[PDB]
Write a protein that binds this ligand. Structure first.
Ligand code: CA
Ligand code: CA
Ligand code: CA
Ligand code: CA
Ligand code: ZN
Ligand code: ZN
Ligand code: ZN
Ligand code: ZN
Lengths: 237, 237, 237, 237
């Protein structure tokens, strides 16, 4: 069904499906079983920042995740996105909880995409930046349990009145406008995304994670993708 | 019905509805009868550039139109857009022909909108730039006779195979994503738009013009808005 | 000597030289006696944000100052900068203390300048953004007591080891590269600046203020411009 | 002496110093003998566009050169610039002619550099764009025979009144402000440069080429670097 390319900030190690034995960042190409992962020293209750970059010349998707006053974690994977995704896609953020839980709060999100053609000065670009989310954010498609406006933040998964995260929750937010990632005369296509998040859990074992993803424009949450599937995949294959 | 704020590049003087006796640029606030106009030395067959700027502190909508090697024309109007438009709008380009005609070709179009909140570093932004249009431009809503792809350009009104402009034509192109122009905690909201166009006509009297506009998100071409109504207004009041 | 255009965040009311009886924001055109002022509810110890905007079509210099959770203050003044400043200028921040004192800490500073020519797509631009300052910031010219690096901030005036602000201090920081604000074929020139600051004082009467300024490229701190003269003017005329 | 990293658009094959037998694009790390090259189908008299990109996560310097209606050429090289260049550098364009000649005209030049720190939202950036050059371009350091203003272009090497390129010429233009490419707390540093050029020669064998380069801030044209040395290297080692 959906074609998904995602960078996961996986908080819970599901060693039975290929996760390493610790929280990690990974690059998922059409499967929850990451093509590449890196140990991530996740900090419960602290605001982190993720940066994702890619360009069609190098064909390498890279991500860096950091917390203030700490060393960052980085993961890269050689992949030609032209061979994986359609030329028009939507970009978004996804998150889930299962038996274990955590808040999956997004405080800001920016994205820039550029397509430079062989025509002199021919540059097509799209850029958006959210540092504040309102209750009625018309330029975002919210799916599942995702809501905006609470403290000006985007809550990807269910959080009750008292601020407590709920289990078995899944939610995604996609930018309204389709994004053009390939064009026949483009000499270089590139994108960069940045988002800050706050993962907090009253438990010693938070779950399940947050993911930045790129999909077919009509992507929807697959049935039963709560928990380990991050609201992105229908199964663990 | 629709709420329209537009900057018109009016090529045909309809003196019976308030147009001055020459091609002109004007600022239209909910009516085709411009609140302010300026003489425009239109050049048949030459590529021109229009710049439109506005900010919520000054509350002045200004536009500058120029052609290479020539003096520009500028028009400004004091207007508080918060009092005219809804907080969420769509932006676009419109054009028409009637008994007289011209090509209403758009070669490039960029737009930037910013909302700066009272929160330290709280900036929400949207920016798009098209220097090339493809046949299937999924991030544009095309209405009426508007088409993309021909020579990588956006043709707002009907042009036949041989490049000849057709009469009684009307077309508009709006950016797919809604644009947020007001927010309760914004201290300054601003936008700037730029587009280059090519108006060419085999006749001594081309018509009718091109307009950059901002409207309610669900705006559609009003019935019978070809010709002098620029595909924006239902009547000449 | 120097030609100065500045937006002052004046913390001390020197009613003898024209200041109103309260902290205020003002627009200074070649004189410390502001052409226009607005009451400013200054908050000792809180981080504020100032936004300054201007364009050559409207010829209006406007500034907005705000603190989180508070209403902002705004001041505007109609002035054609082409008639006041040379075509090449330097932009910077200045601050001073006198018998009364305060810290004049800058946490971030961004500036964007654009010159759009009548040539199709002819845009010249300069943009810089500092969200962190290092000890050896080679792209800034520091004058007087200004230093960078302390906590990644820019300290415009002298602050001793224990964090206490010192009196009779003056310092300025200018961006290294000259900025082009006028060009014979420009149809529109514009700029926008934003900076966040932290003014803190152990006294009930802090002084003297911070100013964003634009000057001739070779501008230097005038002799005896500590205190009420904000490190910008040689006298109070 | 100078530390140079450059992307050369080499028009003349000096097979005696390692050039392949055809015009080519190459990546030079402290030596004119390119670490990597790619065949370049140079078009005499046509305006081309070069794009150069790099980021500290991937540590790969890549360049793409294209002409309208033609396939592009691309070259990449894995190199960690932190290990080659100082933390503060200047960026520029260089060109030369020798016994053979060509015009080395630059029509536009843009550059963007970003340093993202581990602090939430800590981004330092520098961006400049020249689409028009004036006679007195104060934000550029011109070395050798380089001049600005002629037709609003930057002429890197000597061209006589009649538009004819002169031999044994060398010239460079560097942006005035130093550029910060490394900082202890940066999690990702990146830059992208784009320039359009016009190489024209009345001869069948034009020479010698144009290069985008990054150097120590105080870099100057090495003695005798006309011709094959591109105004960048003191010798052919
Ligand atoms: Ca997992
Ligand atoms: Ca008319
Ligand atoms: Ca005062
Ligand atoms: Ca050579
Ligand atoms: Zn995983
Ligand atoms: Zn009219
Ligand atoms: Zn004052
Ligand atoms: Zn070579």
């Amino acid at each position: 069904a959906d074609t998904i390319v995602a960078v996961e900030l996986d908080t819970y190690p599901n060693t039975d499906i290929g996760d390493p034995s610790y929280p990690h960042i990974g690059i998922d190409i059409k499967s929850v079983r990451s093509k590449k992962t890196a140990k991530w020293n996740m900090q419960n209750g602290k605001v982190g920042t993720a940066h994702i970059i890619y360009n069609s010349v190098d064909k390498r998707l890279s991500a860096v995740v950091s917390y203030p006053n700490a060393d960052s974690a980085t993961v890269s994977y050689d992949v030609d996105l032209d061979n994986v995704l359609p030329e028009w896609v939507r970009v978004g953020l996804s998150a889930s909880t299962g038996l274990y839980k955590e808040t999956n709060t997004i405080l800001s999100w920016s994205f820039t995409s550029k397509l430079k053609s062989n025509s002199t000065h021919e540059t097509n670009a799209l850029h958006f930046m959210f540092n504040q989310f309102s209750k009625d954010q018309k330029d975002l498609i919210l799916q599942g349990d995702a809501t905006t406006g609470t403290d000006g933040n985007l809550e990807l998964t269910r959080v009750s009145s008292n601020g407590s995260p709920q289990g078995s929750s899944v939610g995604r937010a996609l930018f309204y406008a389709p994004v053009h990632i390939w064009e026949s005369s483009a000499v270089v296509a590139s994108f960069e995304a940045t988002f800050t998040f706050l993962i907090k859990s009253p438990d010693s074992h938070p779950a399940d994670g947050i993911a930045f993803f790129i999909s077919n424009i009509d992507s929807s949450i697959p049935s039963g993708s709560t928990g380990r599937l991050l609201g992105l995949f229908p199964d663990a294959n």
